Design an enzyme around this catalytic site. Structure first.
Site, mmCIF file in Angstrom:
data_model
loop_
_atom_site.group_PDB
_atom_site.id
_atom_site.type_symbol
_atom_site.label_atom_id
_atom_site.label_comp_id
_atom_site.label_asym_id
_atom_site.label_seq_id
_atom_site.Cartn_x
_atom_site.Cartn_y
_atom_site.Cartn_z
ATOM 1 N N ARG A 1 2.254 -15.106 7.840
ATOM 2 C CA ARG A 1 2.714 -13.736 8.004
ATOM 3 C C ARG A 1 3.734 -13.827 9.144
ATOM 4 O O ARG A 1 3.811 -14.717 9.801
ATOM 5 C CB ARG A 1 1.644 -12.867 8.766
ATOM 6 N N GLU B 1 0.936 -1.211 -0.055
ATOM 7 C CA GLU B 1 -0.105 0.069 0.155
ATOM 8 C C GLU B 1 0.770 1.420 -0.105
ATOM 9 O O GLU B 1 1.680 1.385 0.687
ATOM 10 C CB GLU B 1 -0.828 0.127 1.186
ATOM 11 N N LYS C 1 -0.597 2.126 13.064
ATOM 12 C CA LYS C 1 -0.385 3.355 12.665
ATOM 13 C C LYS C 1 -0.914 4.264 13.457
ATOM 14 O O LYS C 1 -0.503 5.417 13.787
ATOM 15 C CB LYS C 1 -0.968 3.521 11.129
HETATM 16 CL CL LIG Z 1 -4.385 2.103 12.817
#
Ligand SMILES: [Cl-]
Ligand SMILES: [Cl-]
Ligand SMILES: [Cl-]
Ligand SMILES: [Cl-]
Ligand SMILES: [Cl-]
Ligand SMILES: [Mn+2]
Ligand SMILES: [Mn+2]
Ligand SMILES: [Mn+2]
Ligand SMILES: [Mn+2]
Length: 502
Positions: free
Chosen positions: A238, A17, A248
């Site tokens: 993963r 992304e 984030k």
């Molecule tokens: Cl987040």
């Protein structure tokens, strides 16, 4: 799995992304896509997965590209998911015209629970032309269009929650797209866009972390329903670590609250941060190759990665010496004179490829207060790389001893490091030892923040360490492993301790 892969004809793609910095999670993906592409002498695409509007604080593409180069990963071409919106819209209409997509204005809770209990919604049997009218509404971003989404018409009674009419398009009129602004009012979903784009872009082998759901059956359905060239899709586990905040929101919290100073702080999971903390791409890639699968949801420990890194770097880096600057105490070899003798030593005692360095001695030396306060009168110890001495009187404010260099190192058990007392040539350094930002392994959360997780120490180091250039890694005798991070006015070094897995 590289199913039916053909040498010289494999195309993979790494699809980050473009809305954040590369972090160690991406690590596996970036490497495996490159691994398999090189295994088959094929190509690796870089595709920025910008399929839905996301508010961005910075154009992150440059950062991602630079980090990928810093890992030795090279890619054939760079694309954007967003580059196929027009094509994706075309396909969406084809789907509607084969009665394999419909518009649905049902609500999100209602839709979620009818999918749970398996009820086909009222609009599932809309006419093709009604579905087309409504899709154009979405394309235009009108009131009605925002009330609607497009779903695939598969099988609501299916065993697999992903085959019960997944959503294909959505109407987003308020958030701008980081490339096309408000030019598009409808956007494809990840699940609809990924198969199509991989197929038309030439991907033979799509690699994807296992998300614990069977998106694979869905992917494939889209590819066959549209009658596209087939793509093989392999799911791998993963890669995630303990004590690592990867969210984030909380990362931004750290940064805006001055707990860290940049997103490149070494306590952060960004690629730039961890390289800055002293990891080698070799260590990371070998760690990945060596770790095998992981149950969905499991977090790895850092110790094995740092131990791998130590085994990698231990043989190819110089060994220097440093003592604590404020607590170092003076040792005098009373039989010598203050004439400064200079001898060539080897930077690595077991690897002369790294070459030589100059060593300076005098009658005056600097040793560690701990080492010092361990000594006893008439005890014969060894100044490493120089020779042995016998302690006379421990005055601790000073130590007086007499040289005896020509004696053997075998009969000696204490082997301490030292620095020649030449303040005008000793190099002043700051050592940073980092700790994890959170106390726990996973998630009132800020009550688990290690705020005091950056420990600084001032030391003196050998003159020859001036020879090091920024980003060089090395070992401090009886101290540990470090990487030069910054050179300051008056050659003041900033050195970051590299964890070693112990
Ligand atoms: Cl987040
Ligand atoms: Cl949904
Ligand atoms: Cl795996
Ligand atoms: Cl910093
Ligand atoms: Cl020891
Ligand atoms: Mn961008
Ligand atoms: Mn003299
Ligand atoms: Mn001598
Ligand atoms: Mn600590």
């Amino acid at each position: 799995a590289m199913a039916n892969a053909v040498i010289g004809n494999v195309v993979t793609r790494f699809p980050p992304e473009p809305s954040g910095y590369l972090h160690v999670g991406h690590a596996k993906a970036a490497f495996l896509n490159n691994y398999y592409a090189q295994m088959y002498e094929g190509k690796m695409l870089l595709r920025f997965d910008d399929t839905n509007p996301v508010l961005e604080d910075i154009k992150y593409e440059k950062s991602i590209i630079e980090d990928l180069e810093n890992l030795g990963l090279k890619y054939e071409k760079i694309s954007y998911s967003s580059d196929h919106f027009d094509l994706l819209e075309k396909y969406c209409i084809d789907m509607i015209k084969m009665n394999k997509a419909y518009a649905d204005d049902t609500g999100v809770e209602d839709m979620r629970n009818q999918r749970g209990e398996g009820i086909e919604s009222i609009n599932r049997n809309n006419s093709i032309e009604k579905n087309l009218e409504l899709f154009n509404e979405m394309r235009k971003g009108t009131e009605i269009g925002q009330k609607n989404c497009i779903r695939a018409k598969i099988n609501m009674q299916s065993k697999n929650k992903c085959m019960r009419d997944p959503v294909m398009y959505r109407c987003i009129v308020d958030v701008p797209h980081h490339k096309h602004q408000f030019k598009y009012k409808c956007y494809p979903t990840y699940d609809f866009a990924c198969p199509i784009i991989d197929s038309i872009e030439g991907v033979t082998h799509a690699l994807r972390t296992n998300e614990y759901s069977d998106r694979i059956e869905q992917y494939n359905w889209f590819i066959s329903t549209l009658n596209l060239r087939k793509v093989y899709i392999y799911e791998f586990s993963r890669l995630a670590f303990v004590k690592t905040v990867m969210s984030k929101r909380k990362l931004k919290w750290f940064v805006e609250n001055n707990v860290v100073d940049s997103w490149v702080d070494p306590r952060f999971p960004t690629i730039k941060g961890i390289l800055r903390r002293g990891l080698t791409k070799e260590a990371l890639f070998q760690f990945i190759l060596e770790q095998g699968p992981s149950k969905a949801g499991n977090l790895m420990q850092w110790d094995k990665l740092w131990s791998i890194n130590k085994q990698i770097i231990d043989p190819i880096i110089p060994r220097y010496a440093a003592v604590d600057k404020n607590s170092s105490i003076l040792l005098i070899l009373t039989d010598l004179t203050d004439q400064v003798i200079q001898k060539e030593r080897d930077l690595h005692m077991k690897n002369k490829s790294l070459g030589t360095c100059n060593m300076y001695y005098n009658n005056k030396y600097l040793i560690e207060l701990e080492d010092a306060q361990t000594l006893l009168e008439n005890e014969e110890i060894t100044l490493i790389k120089l020779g042995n001495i016998i302690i006379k009187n421990i005055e601790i404010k000073q130590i007086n001893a007499l040289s005896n260099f020509h004696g053997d190192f075998k009969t000696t058990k204490k082997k301490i490091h030292w620095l020649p007392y030449l303040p005008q040539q000793l190099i002043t350094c700051t050592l940073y030892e980092y700790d994890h930002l959170i106390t726990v392994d996973k998630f009132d959360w800020t009550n688990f923040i290690n705020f005091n997780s950056k420990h600084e120490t001032l030391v003196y180091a050998e003159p020859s360490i001036s020879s090091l250039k920024v980003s060089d890694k090395f070992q401090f005798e009886r101290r540990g492993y470090f990487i030069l991070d910054k050179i300051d006015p008056h050659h003041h070094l900033h050195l970051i301790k590299i964890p070693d897995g112990k």
